[model samples]
Target: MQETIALTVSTLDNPFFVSLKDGAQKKATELGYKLVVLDSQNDPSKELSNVEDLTVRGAKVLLINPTDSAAVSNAVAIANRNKIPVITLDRGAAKGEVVSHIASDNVAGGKMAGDFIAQKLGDGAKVIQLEGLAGTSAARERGEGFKQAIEAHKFDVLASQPADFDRTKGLNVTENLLASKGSVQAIFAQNDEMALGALRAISAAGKKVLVVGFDGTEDGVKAVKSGKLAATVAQQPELIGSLGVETADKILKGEKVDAKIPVALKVVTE
Candidate 1:
């Protein structure tokens, strides 16, 4: 009843993925399966290398936090060729086959943020959109969901640009967008890091635009407490990680696992 499984994370530098890794190890130990982890350093080349190492170790299952949707397919394809079942967590592969894709409903999470923004600012509000990393399903789905919801209320999107899901980039991009636009009323960042980053820019400019974020990180909650962020769509990274491992185990046992697994999202506010 013992077999090895592996998790390859996009980067451990981010606390979310660190907590996710923790969740997997905790459940995996209880299940009596050894869970090995590797960091891709946000590099597809590193991701490709990690898959090879996992295969060499005879890992029966792989749960991947892909670095790039398109670039990640090569690694997943390798695991497919090796006959090791692969599952995607939080992010997904563009072309490779997966037993299941486990994460929050990012599209719904986006709409949650949008709905919160519209609730606060009402219809016809001008809002800027600070998008996540390009080519990411999370970012794309979230953006699409947000857009769909806000369209119902007649939202005027001032600007939509990718800040690559980083706070520094969020701040920089928001600053530029702020200077370029006139009479902006609201802003939505795809993740909390960018939201927090955009907050500083909004504050420095002495504007009272309603700002919303996704991911609901620790600091994001704190920002809501301090009245810096209007709200955030929170997804449980730990639960997502745990579910990914659980599904991987199910696949190995020839149990039925669905092609997609969804975790819930909450709109966190003060």
Candidate 2:
């Protein structure tokens, strides 16, 4: 019987995670393995259940894109008990043993976004920050990196609030922020979806703001090309996913693999 590999992701709703799934599934098939995919729909409880189910199904290896780093610890622990080799893609678990983690340097990407904004706006530039989900590692690390870069300059952060990584929430939050804080020179969103939403809000408010985003989704790149957004810190989610499957193959074969594998990141601008 062919060995089965189980893959679980936070959500397939976004283009980023969808691309990740495509890469992982492709690589698994190429390696003569059958892959079973599960979507958590951005719920940690659901994620835990999916892990348990995959374990019950006797998967030889597991690939996880966590919904919350801390919350994923329980799932990782279950995988450990089942003796299933785990490889994390994109987000990571806060606890338990995993063969490898494959992802871009999100903190560095955040710094890239910050530096771009700082260079464009100069000193004392008032800006707003649109954050991702509250508890996720991606949100915390990105915020830390942005703060570190912007603090060196005299940038005044008007407000930094969570949009929960949802496009509609990004739009509503930005609209409310603009109403209260008046107009700002720039806005930095943690992801492309939020950045696009912020762009829509800015256009409706009749303001010209230097907007920046993370993730190089097709729509986000198009916005940059059209001068609607200043720049984006592009992450290689598909590459990360592909590498995760390759690393899993190594682990299953009793071959050594790096515990941490960083993909690549690039700053994209038009």
Candidate 3:
């Protein structure tokens, strides 16, 4: 008999998590497994509790997009102790034996942004970086890649701060940074929504800063085409979610699966 799988994410309200849930649901239905979804709403403790509840309800598989990388170890360990397979999507847990990790090459995505900015603004350009939630693998990897590219090209990094991956926070943070910096040639926002926020701040300040972001969400793509956002690195959240379920099914069927699923990313510009 097919068993139920619990898919938990950072937040259901975010488009990224919503798309992941959609993908997981569609694939789970096709594969004859019942699906249970829980939202952590960006709370690490809540996510841990949700996993426990799902386990008690007889979940055989747990797919998680952790809210906090370090805090997720306990939840993963719980699933491990129960002999339930765990798959991590997007954000990775700090310490755990997840069956597989499925996510976009965030480092490559950041490199793409860095290269794009370098090509547009030339060497020695002044730029600011708007980062995502701190202490997460995605944020750290993307920032590392971006910083590497900037150093390689000899671009000056004026300032960088965490936006926590929220649109409101992105906007407010970028606004404050721009107000204080006075002028910058380019702004590298780790995600599209943050990029859009930075664009708004740049426009309000009457500055001609090139704004680059990650995540090719609908708004980000549309903004790129409209010339509002210079470019965005695209990460396919649905594909990641769907493929994660497929991999889980394969593992459950006693088939060997790859430890790392290679997901592709692209850069889109207006």
Reference-based TM-score, model 2: 0.97
C-alpha RMSD between model 1 and the true structure: 1.4
Summarize candidate 2's per-residue lDDT along 51-72 as a digit string, tens digits: 9999999999999999988889
Which has the higher TM-score value, candidate number 1 or candidate number 3? Answer: 3
Provide TM-scores for the models.
0.96, 0.97, 0.97
lDDT of 3: 0.86
lDDT of each: 0.88, 0.89, 0.86
Off by over 4 Å in 3: none
lDDT of 1 by residue, 1-270 (tens): 479999999988666788789889888987779999999988889999999999999999999999888889899998999999999999988898888999889988888888888898888889888998777789989998988877887898889999988889999999998899858898999988899989999889887778898877888889998988999898888888888888888888889998989989998889
* Superposition error at 265 for model 1 (Å): 0.5
Better of 2 and 3 by lDDT: 2
**Candidate 2, backbone clash total:** 0
Candidate 2 lDDT score at position 76: 96
lDDT against true structure, model 2: 0.89
Clashes of each: 0, 0, 1
